[PDB]
Amino acid sequence: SLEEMLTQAVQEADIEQVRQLLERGADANFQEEEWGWSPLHSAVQMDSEDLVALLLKHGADPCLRKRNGATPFIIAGITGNVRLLQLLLPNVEDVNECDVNGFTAFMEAAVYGRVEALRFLYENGADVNMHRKTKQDQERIRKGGATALMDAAEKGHVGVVTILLHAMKAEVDARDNMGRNALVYALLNPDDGKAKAITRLLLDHGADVNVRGEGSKTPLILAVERKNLDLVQMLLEQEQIEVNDTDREGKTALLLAVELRLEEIAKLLCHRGASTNCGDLVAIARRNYDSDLVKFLRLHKAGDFRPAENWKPQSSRWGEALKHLHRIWRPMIGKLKIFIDEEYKIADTAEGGIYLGLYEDQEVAVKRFSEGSTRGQQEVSCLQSSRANDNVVTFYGSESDGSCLHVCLALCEYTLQEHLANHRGDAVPNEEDESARNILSSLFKAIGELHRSGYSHQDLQPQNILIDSKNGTFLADFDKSIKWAEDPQKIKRDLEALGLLVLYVVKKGDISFETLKNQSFEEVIQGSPDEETRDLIHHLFHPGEDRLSSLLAHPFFWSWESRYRTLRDVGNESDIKTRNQNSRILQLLQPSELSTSFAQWTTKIDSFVMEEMNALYQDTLGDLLKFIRNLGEHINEQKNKKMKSIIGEPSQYFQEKFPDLVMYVYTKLQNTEYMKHFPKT
Amino acid sequence: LEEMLTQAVQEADIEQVRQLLERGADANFQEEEWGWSPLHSAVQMDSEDLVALLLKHGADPCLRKRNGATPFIIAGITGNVRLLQLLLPNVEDVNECDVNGFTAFMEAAVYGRVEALRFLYENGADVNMHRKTKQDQERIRKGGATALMDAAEKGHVGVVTILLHAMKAEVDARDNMGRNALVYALLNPDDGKAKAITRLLLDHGADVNVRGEGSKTPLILAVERKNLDLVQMLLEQEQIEVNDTDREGKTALLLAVELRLEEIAKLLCHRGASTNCGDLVAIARRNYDSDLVKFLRLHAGEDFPPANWKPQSSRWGEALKHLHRIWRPMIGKLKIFIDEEYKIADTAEGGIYLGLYEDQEVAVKRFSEGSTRGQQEVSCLQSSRANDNVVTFYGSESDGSCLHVCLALCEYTLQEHLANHRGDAVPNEEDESARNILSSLFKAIGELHRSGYSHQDLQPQNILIDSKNGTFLADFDKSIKWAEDPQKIKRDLEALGLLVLYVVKKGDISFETLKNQSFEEVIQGSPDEETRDLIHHLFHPGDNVEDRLSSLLAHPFFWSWESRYRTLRDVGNESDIKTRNQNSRILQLLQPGTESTSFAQWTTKIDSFVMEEMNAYNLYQDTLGDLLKFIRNLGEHINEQKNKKMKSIIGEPSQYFQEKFPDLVMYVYTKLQNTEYMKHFPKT
Numbered sequence A: 001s002l003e004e005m006l007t008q009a010v011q012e013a014d015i016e017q018v019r020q021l022l023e024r025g026a027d028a029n030f031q032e033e034e035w036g037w038s039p040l041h042s043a044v045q046m047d048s049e050d051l052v053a054l055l056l057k058h059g060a061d062p063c064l065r066k067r068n069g070a071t072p073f074i075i076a077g078i079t080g081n082v083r084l085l086q087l088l089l090p091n092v093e094d095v096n097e098c099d100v101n102g103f104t105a106f107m108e109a110a111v112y113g114r115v116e117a118l119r120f121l122y123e124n125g126a127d128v129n130m131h132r133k134t135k136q137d138q139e140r141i142r143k144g145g146a147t148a149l150m151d152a153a154e155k156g157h158v159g160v161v162t163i164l165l166h167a168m169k170a171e172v173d174a175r176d177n178m179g180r181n182a183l184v185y186a187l188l189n190p191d192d193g194k195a196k197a198i199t200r201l202l203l204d205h206g207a208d209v210n211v212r213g214e215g216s217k218t219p220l221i222l223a224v225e226r227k228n229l230d231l232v233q234m235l236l237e238q239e240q241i242e243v244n245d246t247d248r249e250g251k252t253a254l255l256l257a258v259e260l261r262l263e264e265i266a267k268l269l270c271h272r273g274a275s276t277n278c279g280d281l282v283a284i285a286r287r288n289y290d291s292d293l294v295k296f297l298r299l300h301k302a303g304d305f306r307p308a309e310n311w312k313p314q315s316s317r318w319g320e321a322l323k324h325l326h327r328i329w330r331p332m333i334g335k336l337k338i339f340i341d342e343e344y345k346i347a348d349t350a351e352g353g354i355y356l357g358l359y360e361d362q363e364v365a366v367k368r369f370s371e372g373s374t375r376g377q378q379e380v381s382c383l384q385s386s387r388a389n390d391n392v393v394t395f396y397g398s399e400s401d402g403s404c405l406h407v408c409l410a411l412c413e414y415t416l417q418e419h420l421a422n423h424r425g426d427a428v429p430n431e432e433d434e435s436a437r438n439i440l441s442s443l444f445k446a447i448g449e450l451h452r453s454g455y456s457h458q459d460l461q462p463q464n465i466l467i468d469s470k471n472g473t474f475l476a477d478f479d480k481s482i483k484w485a486e487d488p489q490k491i492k493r494d495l496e497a498l499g500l501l502v503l504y505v506v507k508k509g510d511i512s513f514e515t516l517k518n519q520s521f522e523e524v525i526q527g528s529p530d531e532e533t534r535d536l537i538h539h540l541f542h543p544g545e546d547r548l549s550s551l552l553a554h555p556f557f558w559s560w561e562s563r564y565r566t567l568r569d570v571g572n573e574s575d576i577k578t579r580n581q582n583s584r585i586l587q588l589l590q591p592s593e594l595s596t597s598f599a600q601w602t603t604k605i606d607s608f609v610m611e612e613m614n615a616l617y618q619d620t621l622g623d624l625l626k627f628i629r630n631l632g633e634h635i636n637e638q639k640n641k642k643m644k645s646i647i648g649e650p651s652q653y654f655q656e657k658f659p660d661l662v663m664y665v666y667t668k669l670q671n672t673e674y675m676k677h678f679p680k681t
Numbered sequence B: 001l002e003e004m005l006t007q008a009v010q011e012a013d014i015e016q017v018r019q020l021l022e023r024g025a026d027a028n029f030q031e032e033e034w035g036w037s038p039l040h041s042a043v044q045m046d047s048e049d050l051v052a053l054l055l056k057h058g059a060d061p062c063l064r065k066r067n068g069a070t071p072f073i074i075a076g077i078t079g080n081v082r083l084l085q086l087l088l089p090n091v092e093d094v095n096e097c098d099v100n101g102f103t104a105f106m107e108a109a110v111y112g113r114v115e116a117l118r119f120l121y122e123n124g125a126d127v128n129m130h131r132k133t134k135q136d137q138e139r140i141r142k143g144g145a146t147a148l149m150d151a152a153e154k155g156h157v158g159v160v161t162i163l164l165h166a167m168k169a170e171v172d173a174r175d176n177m178g179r180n181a182l183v184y185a186l187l188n189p190d191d192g193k194a195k196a197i198t199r200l201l202l203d204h205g206a207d208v209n210v211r212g213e214g215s216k217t218p219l220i221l222a223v224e225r226k227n228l229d230l231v232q233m234l235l236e237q238e239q240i241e242v243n244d245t246d247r248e249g250k251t252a253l254l255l256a257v258e259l260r261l262e263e264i265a266k267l268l269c270h271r272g273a274s275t276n277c278g279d280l281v282a283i284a285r286r287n288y289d290s291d292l293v294k295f296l297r298l299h300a301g302e303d304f305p306p307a308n309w310k311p312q313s314s315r316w317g318e319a320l321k322h323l324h325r326i327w328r329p330m331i332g333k334l335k336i337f338i339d340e341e342y343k344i345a346d347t348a349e350g351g352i353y354l355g356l357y358e359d360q361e362v363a364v365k366r367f368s369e370g371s372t373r374g375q376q377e378v379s380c381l382q383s384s385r386a387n388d389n390v391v392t393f394y395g396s397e398s399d400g401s402c403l404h405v406c407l408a409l410c411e412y413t414l415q416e417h418l419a420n421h422r423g424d425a426v427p428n429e430e431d432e433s434a435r436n437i438l439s440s441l442f443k444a445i446g447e448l449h450r451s452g453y454s455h456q457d458l459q460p461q462n463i464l465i466d467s468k469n470g471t472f473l474a475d476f477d478k479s480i481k482w483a484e485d486p487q488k489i490k491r492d493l494e495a496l497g498l499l500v501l502y503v504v505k506k507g508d509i510s511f512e513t514l515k516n517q518s519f520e521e522v523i524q525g526s527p528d529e530e531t532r533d534l535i536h537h538l539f540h541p542g543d544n545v546e547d548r549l550s551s552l553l554a555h556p557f558f559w560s561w562e563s564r565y566r567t568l569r570d571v572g573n574e575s576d577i578k579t580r581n582q583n584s585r586i587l588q589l590l591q592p593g594t595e596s597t598s599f600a601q602w603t604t605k606i607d608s609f610v611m612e613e614m615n616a617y618n619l620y621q622d623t624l625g626d627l628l629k630f631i632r633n634l635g636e637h638i639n640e641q642k643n644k645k646m647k648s649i650i651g652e653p654s655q656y657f658q659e660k661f662p663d664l665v666m667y668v669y670t671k672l673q674n675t676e677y678m679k680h681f682p683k684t
C-alpha cells in the first residue's frame, strides 16, 4: 500500500504527496511485477521534471530495467524533453544502452521524431549507425538490425531524416538482418509528400535501389502498388535500376501497372525498358476497359507472348468446373478466388448459396452470408470451435468483401441423400447393412463432440450431412446452431433429429426425411425394421449430456457376428450349462416383462435340429443361450452337415427367428459383470 | 477459321473486316467463353469506324454477352457520345440493365464520363435507379446502389455535383445494405476528393447517422482514415451521434485514443463525447501520448473493465489466461507476445509460442518470411487438412518480417508423454497405449504419402499428444513432395521402424541410441515376435511400396491379446483339427512334411496337472494341430466349476500361451495369411 500510494501519487502528479512518502521511506526502485515499471520510468513517460528531480534525489536508479529491458533514460528519448536527458546522463553508464529488442535512446528519439533530443544525444556519444541487437530467437528468423535512419524513414519524419544524413553522418545503405535498407522503409509510409521527400534525400546519398523488401518486392514494385507516378519517376532516374525484377509470385512492375489500370506509370515503364513478355498485358488492359493503353501496348508488339496448365483438382464431381475456375482471371477477396456464376454453384441456401472457390490455391465450398447476418456469425463461431472435431467439415477461414461474409469449407463429393441414391443398387436386399453403422457412428461422434464443445446444431437433416471421396461423413451448415448453455433442453432437437436420421439411413434413403418429420414418435418406432433400431431411436427421444458416446456401445452398432459371438459367450457360462437356478447370471436373466419371442422357443425351431441337439432343452432363456453356444461349437462338424443346411448362416438364423433376443440380453446384462461378454465397443 | 478470324477486329484494321464481312462469318458470332461479339469488342476499343461497318451488317445492338451486356451499356463505359448516337435508335429502353443491375448511365457514373452522362439524362435515363440483381445476390443484401453512390465511391467530384444539382439525384438513397453515398464517399483512397464529395452530400442533407461495413458510422470511418478535416466536417452537423459504436463496441473516441490521434481525440471530447467508453487514460499512456494523457486526466476513465474466457489446455492454461488478459496488437487474426512465459519450445527457426487465433488457443511456429522451410511447412499443412492425425492447421499470418504458422495446441510431446505414463502398466500386462499411438502414426504417414508428401524427419519430438491422448504428427519444415524422388518414402518408413521399438520400449531406449544402431540390432532389440516381424516389414518395405502402411495395420502386432487367443481358439475349432485329419486343407497349411519352433514337443512344456486333466478323451500329440485343439478345449472349459485348479495354474490363458510359446501367433498368422482361413483373424 505504501509504494502503491507512491505509484498512484506519481500517476496523479501530486508533487507534495510524493515528497512525504519518499521521506516516509517508500522505495523509488519498486517495480510492479507485471511490466516492470518504476516510479522513475513513469515520471519520465508523463513528462513532469519536478517528479524526476525529486526521485533522483532519493536514489532512484536511472539504469533500472522494466520488462522490455528499457531504462528511464531510454524512455526520455521517446519523451523528447532535453532537461530530463540532462538530469539522467551523470548516472548513465553507457548512453548506447539497449532494451531487449536492441532499442537505444537515440533510436527512440528517431522513432518519435524528437529533433532536439536527437541533437543532445548526438553531441554525447550516441552511435548513429547502431543496428538493433536482439535476442537469439528474433535473430534466428532474421529479425532486428535496423537503424535510426530506417526508423525515421518508416515513420516519415522528414526533419529527422534531413538531420541524420547531413549533420550526423548516417550510413544510407546500412542493412537490417532481413537485407532491407531505409529506402524500403521509406516507401511503406502512408503519406505522399513525406514519402516523396525522404526518397529524394536517400536516393541522392546513394541508397541501393536493387533491394528486396517484404514479399521479395523491390522499391519499384512498391512505388507501382502505391499508385504514385512521383515515386516512380525518382526511381527510374537511375540507370542501374533493374526494371525487369520479379517479386514473390513472378509479377513484374509493369505487369502490376497494367493490372492496376495506371496509364502514365505503364507508359513511362515501357519507355524505360520494361520488357513486354511477362504476361498478356494487352488482354489485361482490355478487361480493364483501358482503350488508350491497349493501342500503346499493340504499338510495341514483339511478334504475341504466350503463357503450361499444371494444377489438377482433387474432386471428381467438381473437377472440370474447378479447372475452369483456376484457368480464368478473377480478383481476390483476401485468400479467396470466387465467381458468382451458375457453372460454379454447388447448391442453394436460405441466404447466398454455396459456390466453388479456391482458397490459397486449394479447392473449397464457399457459403455466403450478408456480413451483418446473425446467421453467418453463428456459423463462423461454431466452425472456429470445431477445428478438433474430426467429423465436422474442415474450415479454411472466412473472408469479407465488405458487403459479404464468405465462409470457406472443405469441398465434399455428395450430400448424404445423394450418396444413398448412388449406392442404393449395391446390396442384395437382405444383406447386413455395415454402411449404415459407419455413417451413423460418424454422426454420433460428430454430434457428441459438438455438444462437448458447447454447441448444438438445431437443423440436423440429410442435406446438412456430407460424404467425401473416401466415404467419410461430415456434419455441416451451422447457421442455426446455438451455444446450448443458453437453453440446455434444446439439445433434445439434435437428439430427435438423430433418431429420425437413424431410420432414414437404415431405410437406405427410401423414406424421405420430410415424410419422417411429419410422423409422430410411435409411427417412427413402428416404421423401424428391427428391435435394435427401435430401442436405439427410443433412447434418442428419451435421453438421460454425454449420452451419445455411450450409445455407440448399443447393439445396433454390433455386427451380426459380434451379436452371435456375444450370445455364444453368454451361453458358455458355467451356471447356464449346469442350469444353476441359484446363480447370479440366471437371476439377472429371470423376469414384470411382456411376452417374448423366445418363450417356448423349442416349438419354433425345426424339429430335426431339435432332436439332433437333444442328443432336456427347456423353454428358458438360459437354455436358448446354451442352445446357441452348442450349435455354434458343433455346426461345422461332419455329423451335422444336414443340420447346417437347415440353419444356413447361424447369426442370421437366431436373430430372424427371435428378433428380441440380442436386445433382451443386452438389457439384462448391461450394467453387470457379464457386460464383459459384449464386443469391444 | 470462320468465326475465329475476328481478331482483325483485335488488330482493328477496317480492311480485313469489310473484306471478310462478305467472305463468310456471322456478325453476331459470340465467342463461347464470355459472349464477346465483334460489335461488343469494337465499342470497347472505341473505334468509331468499326461500329459503323458492323451496324451496316445487321449486328444487333441489344445483343447480350455473359454478364447481360449490350454494346450500348458498354458505350456508357467508353464514354464517347457518337457511339451512343449511332446506337440509341435501335434499343427499346435506355435504362436496360445487365445481370448485376448496371444501366449505361451507371457505367457513365462509374467511369466519370461527364459528356455521356448529360446525353443519357435528357434522353430519358434514370437517376434514382437502384441496382436490381439476381436473387442470390439479393438474399445476402447486395445491390441497390444508385449512380450517386457509384460516383462518390470512385471519387468523381465532377459527376456528383452534376447529379446533385442538374439531375435531381436523391442524396439519402440507401442500397440494400442500408448505406448512402456518404458511406461510399468516406471509403475513397483520395483525401481531397473525399472531402469535396462529403461536403456536397452533407449539405444536400445525407444522413450522418448511417451504418456501413462492420456497423461503422461515418464518424468512425473518418477517425480510422486518420483525417481531422472529415472529422470536423462531420462534427459540423448538430444531429450527429458521437457515442455511436461499431460491431466490436468501440466508440469513435476510443478509436482516436487507440490510434494516437491527440487532435481528433481532443476535438471529439470538446463536442460532447463520453470519456467512459474504455480506460482511455491507460490507452494514451501505453501509446506514450503524454499531452493527451494530461488532457483526458484534466477532464478521465473513472466511471469505467470487462472480465470469463477459460482455456481448454491444462498444461498451458495459466499462461493462456495471462495472454488473454494483456493488451497486444493483432498480426491479422493472431494475438502473440514474444516472452519466456509464453514459450512452448525452441526451434532451428524462431521457436514455438502460445498464441490466440480468432480467440482460439494455438501453438505458433515462427519463420522468417523469406524461409524455404516456412514455405515447405505451410504447403504441406495446406495439403493435410483432411489428415486427421496431423496437427490442425489454423492459418498463417505475416508481420512483414515474419511468417507465423498457427497450430492446434497439444499437451505433450511423445517423449514427455511416455515419461509421465511410464508407471501406469504393471510391467507384466498388455500395452494398449503403444498400439493406439503407433496405429495413429501409420494412419498419419499413410495419408501424408497419399497427399504426395513425405516427412523426412520422423522422431519423437515431432509427435504430439493432446488432452484426450490422440497422437498427432507435426513439423513439416523438412518435408518434400515425393513424386520427384520416389524412394525417399523409404526413409519415413525406416523412421517408423525406429518409432515402433521406441514406443514398445516405453521410451527407455533413446531415439538417438536407436538411430545409430543398424537394421539388425534394432530387430534384435525387439521384446517379441510381433514387434520383430512388424519392424522387419518397415525396414524392408519393397520398391513396389505403395500402401504398405495400410496393410500393416492388419498385422498381429495390432491385435489385442484377447483377439490373438480368440483366433487360436477359432482355428482350433476346425473340424479337421478335431478329427486330426492329416490329409485336410487346414493341416496341410499348418504342418506339412517331416519341427526349431518353441511349440515342438509342446506337451512336455506345460504343467503336468493341466496336461493330465486335459487328457479326458488318442492322447494329445506334439503337432501344432493338437496345440490349437488344446487351446480351443481349454478356452471352452477353463471356467467350468470342476476346473478351478487348472484356472489358477494358467491364470489369464491369452497371456499364458503367448508366454510359453512366443512364436505361436506369428506362425499361425504366416500360415493362414492369404488363405480362406484368414476369416478367423480379428476385424480392423
Ligand SMILES: Nc1ncnc2c1ncn2[C@@H]1O[C@H](COP(=O)(O)O[C@@H]2[C@H](O)[C@@H](COP(=O)(O)O[C@@H]3[C@H](O)[C@@H](COP(=O)(O)O)O[C@H]3n3cnc4c(N)ncnc43)O[C@H]2n2cnc3c(N)ncnc32)[C@@H](O)[C@H]1O
Pocket: A283, A286, A287, A329, A339, A340, A403, B031, B034, B036, B041, B065, B066, B067, B098, B100, B101, B102, B107, B110, B131, B142, B143, B144, B145
Ligand atoms: N474482346 C475480348 N476477346 C476475348 N476475351 C475478352 C474480350 N474482352 C473481355 N474478355 C474477357 O472477359 C472477362 C471478363 O468479362 P467481362 O469483361 O465481359 O465482364 C465482367 C465480368 O466477367 C463480370 C464479373 O462481375 P463480378 O462477378 O466480379 O461482380 C461485380 C460486383 O460484385 C457487382 C457490383 O455490384 P454492387 O454490389 O456494387 O451493387 O457487379 C460486378 N460489377 C462490379 N463493378 C461493376 C461495373 N462497374 N459494371 C457492371 N458490373 C460490375 O462482370 C463484368 N465486370 C466486372 N467488373 C466490371 C467493371 N468494373 N465495370 C464493368 N463490368 C465489369 C475478362 O477476364 C477477359 O478475359
Ligand SMILES: Nc1ncnc2c1ncn2[C@@H]1O[C@H](COP(=O)(O)O[C@@H]2[C@H](O)[C@@H](COP(=O)(O)O[C@@H]3[C@H](O)[C@@H](COP(=O)(O)O)O[C@H]3n3cnc4c(N)ncnc43)O[C@H]2n2cnc3c(N)ncnc32)[C@@H](O)[C@H]1O
Pocket: A032, A035, A037, A041, A042, A045, A066, A067, A068, A078, A099, A101, A103, A108, A111, A132, A143, A144, A145, A146, B285, B286, B327, B337, B338
Ligand atoms: N507508466 C506505466 N506504468 C505501469 N504500466 C505501464 C505504464 N505504461 C505502460 N504500461 C503498460 O506496460 C505494457 C508494456 O508496455 P511497454 O511500453 O513497457 O512495453 C512494450 C512491449 O511490452 C514491448 C515488446 O513489444 P513487442 O513485442 O510488440 O515488440 C515490438 C517489436 O516487435 C520489437 C522489435 O521491433 P523491430 O526491431 O522489428 O522494429 O520491439 C517492439 N517495439 C516496436 N517498436 C518499438 C519502440 N519504438 N521502442 C521499444 N520497442 C519497440 O516493448 C514495448 N513497446 C512496444 N512498442 C513500442 C513502441 N512503439 N514504443 C516504445 N515501446 C514499445 C503496456 O502495454 C501498458 O499496459
Ligand SMILES: CCN(CC)CCNC(=O)c1c(C)[nH]c(/C=C2\C(=O)Nc3ccc(F)cc32)c1C
Pocket: A346, A347, A348, A354, A364, A365, A393, A409, A410, A411, A412, A413, A414, A415, A417, A418, A463, A464, A466, A476, A477
Ligand atoms: C441430387 C439432386 N439434388 C436435389 C435433392 C440437387 C443437387 N443439390 C443438392 O442436393 C445439394 C444441397 C442441398 N447441398 C449440397 C452441397 C453442400 C451443402 O449443403 N453444404 C455444403 C458444404 C460443403 C460442401 F463441399 C458441399 C455442401 C448439394 C450438392
Ligand SMILES: CCN(CC)CCNC(=O)c1c(C)[nH]c(/C=C2\C(=O)Nc3ccc(F)cc32)c1C
Pocket: B344, B345, B346, B352, B362, B363, B391, B407, B408, B409, B410, B411, B412, B413, B461, B462, B464, B474, B475
Ligand atoms: C521439460 C518440459 N518443459 C516444461 C516443464 C518444456 C520444454 N519443452 C519441450 O520439451 C517441447 C518441445 C521440444 N516441443 C514441444 C511442443 C511442440 C513442437 O515441438 N512442435 C509443436 C507443434 C504444435 C504444438 F502444439 C506443440 C508443439 C514442447 C512442449
